[PDB]
Amino acid sequence: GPHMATGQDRVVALVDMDCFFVQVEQRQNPHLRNKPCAVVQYKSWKGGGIIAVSYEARAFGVTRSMWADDAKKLCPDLLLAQVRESRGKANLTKYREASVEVMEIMSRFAVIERASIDEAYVDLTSAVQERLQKLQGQPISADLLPSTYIEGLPQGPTVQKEGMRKQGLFQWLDSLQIDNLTSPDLQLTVGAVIVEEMRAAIERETGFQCSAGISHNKVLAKLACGLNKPNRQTLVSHGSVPQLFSQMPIRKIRSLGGKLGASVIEILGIEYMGELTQFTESQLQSHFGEKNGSWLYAMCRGIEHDPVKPRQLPKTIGCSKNFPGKTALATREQVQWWLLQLAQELEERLTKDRNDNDRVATQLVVSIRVQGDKRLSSLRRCCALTRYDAHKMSHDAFTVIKNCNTSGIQTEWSPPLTMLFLCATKFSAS
DNA sequence: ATATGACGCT
DNA sequence: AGCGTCAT
Ligand SMILES: Nc1nc2c(ncn2[C@H]2C[C@H](O)[C@@H](COP(=O)(O)NP(=O)(O)OP(=O)(O)O)O2)c(=O)[nH]1
Numbered sequence: 515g516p517h518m519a520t521g522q523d524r525v526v527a528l529v530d531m532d533c534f535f536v537q538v539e540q541r542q543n544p545h546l547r548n549k550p551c552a553v554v555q556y557k558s559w560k561g562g563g564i565i566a567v568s569y570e571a572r573a574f575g576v577t578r579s580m581w582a583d584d585a586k587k588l589c590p591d592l593l594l595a596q597v598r599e600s601r602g603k604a605n606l607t608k609y610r611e612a613s614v615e616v617m618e619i620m621s622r623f624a625v626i627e628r629a630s631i632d633e634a635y636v637d638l639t640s641a642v643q644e645r646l647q648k649l650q651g652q653p654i655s656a657d658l659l660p661s662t663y664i665e666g667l668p669q670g671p672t673v674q675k676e677g678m679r680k681q682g683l684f685q686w687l688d689s690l691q692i693d694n695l696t697s698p699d700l701q702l703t704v705g706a707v708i709v710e711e712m713r714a715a716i717e718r719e720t721g722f723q724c725s726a727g728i729s730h731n732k733v734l735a736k737l738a739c740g741l742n743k744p745n746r747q748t749l750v751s752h753g754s755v756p757q758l759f760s761q762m763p764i765r766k767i768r769s770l771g772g773k774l775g776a777s778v779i780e781i782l783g784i785e786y787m788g789e790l791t792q793f794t795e796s797q798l799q800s801h802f803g804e805k806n807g808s809w810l811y812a813m814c815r816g817i818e819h820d821p822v823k824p825r826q827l828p829k830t831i832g833c834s835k836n837f838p839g840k841t842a843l844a845t846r847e848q849v850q851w852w853l854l855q856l857a858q859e860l861e862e863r864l865t866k867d868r869n870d871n872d873r874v875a876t877q878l879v880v881s882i883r884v885q886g887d888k889r890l891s892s893l894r895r896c897c898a899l900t901r902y903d904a905h906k907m908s909h910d911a912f913t914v915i916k917n918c919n920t921s922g923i924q925t926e927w928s929p930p931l932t933m934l935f936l937c938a939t940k941f942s943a944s
Numbered sequence: 945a946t947a948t949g950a951c952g953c954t
Numbered sequence: 955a956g957c958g959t960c961a962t
């Protein structure tokens with residue numbers, strides 16, 4: 515009871531850029547701003563595949579993984595920016611560089627864990643602590659939180675969004691107790707003040723807008739972030755969890771969006787996160803494993819312990835290209851030439867990485883997919899990465915996969931390869 | 945014909 | 955080491 519863990523020790527935030535690749539292209543091309551527009555890869559087959567969609571375009575039903583030609587049917591004025599194509603493949607350098615702009619600003623405020631090209635978690639516990647004494651028991655004005663939503667408020671005894679937002683924020687602040695600086699709700703509030711600052715600095719110094727979640731762990735902060743996208747941040751308190759989880763589909767929680775989430779729903783016969791609280795931890799472990807059972811028992815009560823790992827840089831550097839359908843590679847000459855094209859991009863990203871970040875990869879993973887296989891990878895092999903030489907890396911990669919060719923004729927390659935993937939890993943300081 | 949990054953299991 | 959899962 516007095517020994518009941520509530521998982522309120524940390525203040526964690528998740529910051530995620532709004533339609534990130536679109537904003538990168540809209541900063542560069544002012545004609546795309548404030549318009550329905552999308553970012554697409556390639557062009558020939560059906561206009562290219564969309565990977566990012568402005569909010570103006572989303573209102574017409576344009577989505578990620580839509581073909582651009584089909585998107586034009588939903589939204590005929592849709593504007594398109596195409597990903598740079600280098601050596602016959604996608605080249606994401608502009609967005610990787612834009613991403614570093616954002617990560618470097620966020621890193622001024624606290625320890626960040628890079629979670630993707632466009633989002634990072636941040637552990638605000640320390641900054642909240644020190645910011646709490648410098649404030650010296652002085653109230654927190656609603657002016658310090660001009661874009662914050664308090665999840666679950668307003669409640670109890672306007673028709674417009676901004677009015678609802680301020681009303682819930684007012685109720686939250688009014689009930690706030692400067693409670694020996696130990697109140698978890700006060701800590702979250704101060705955390706939300708800092709995230710307003712971080713988000714203002716990102717937008718001032720890059721032009722990019724973002725959303726954020728603020729809570730006590732990573733799962734709740736990431737969930738919170740998406741509740742009021744775009745250009746807003748959301749505070750999810752410990753006390754908001756029972757109502758929030760009571761109608762929250764299980765698949766919306768990070769790591770439950772795939773097979774494990776489906777077997778939770780199937781084996782237990784439930785739909786929503788809160789229904790997990792009925793079961794004992796042993797029950798959950800017996801269904802889902804000791805690790806998963808423990809994680810689910812705490813998570814459905816809003817408790818989660820994955821730490822914000824101090825990592826601002828990716829741990830692997832990789833490039834890949836799919837060869838779908840008729841384009842599947844069928845000759846040894848084709849396979850060799852695309853391993854070279856991949857190896858050449860990889861070399862120039864590794865070389866820039868070593869200069870920027872004082873490290874060298876030591877392992878090259880080669881990964882191929884053969885025609886007629888539903889998996890991301892059909893086969894994965896490794897070799898030593900001793901030199902950043904594109905010809906050496908592609909030739910080495912060919913060596914470790916060449917035995918996979920079950921072709922009697924020497925020039926041909928069967929079964930045809932529908933994917934090549936080169937990934938550099940196992941870094942050491944340089 | 946929906947590039948590429950982190951991590952668990954064995 | 956190699957394969958499977960989950961995600962943006
Ligand atoms: N090459 C490639 N890039 C992708 C893919 N999916 C996403 N991206 C790229 C493009 C994305 O812009 C970027 C970040 O992914 P999100 O945060 O999930 N979506 P966004 O930031 O656009 O919108 P909002 O966050 O407001 O919902 O990663 C993909 O399948 N392939």
Ligand SMILES: [Mg+2]
Binds near residue numbers: 530531532632
């Ligand atoms: Mg985003």
Ligand SMILES: [Mg+2]
Binds near residue numbers: 531632962
């Ligand atoms: Mg994201």
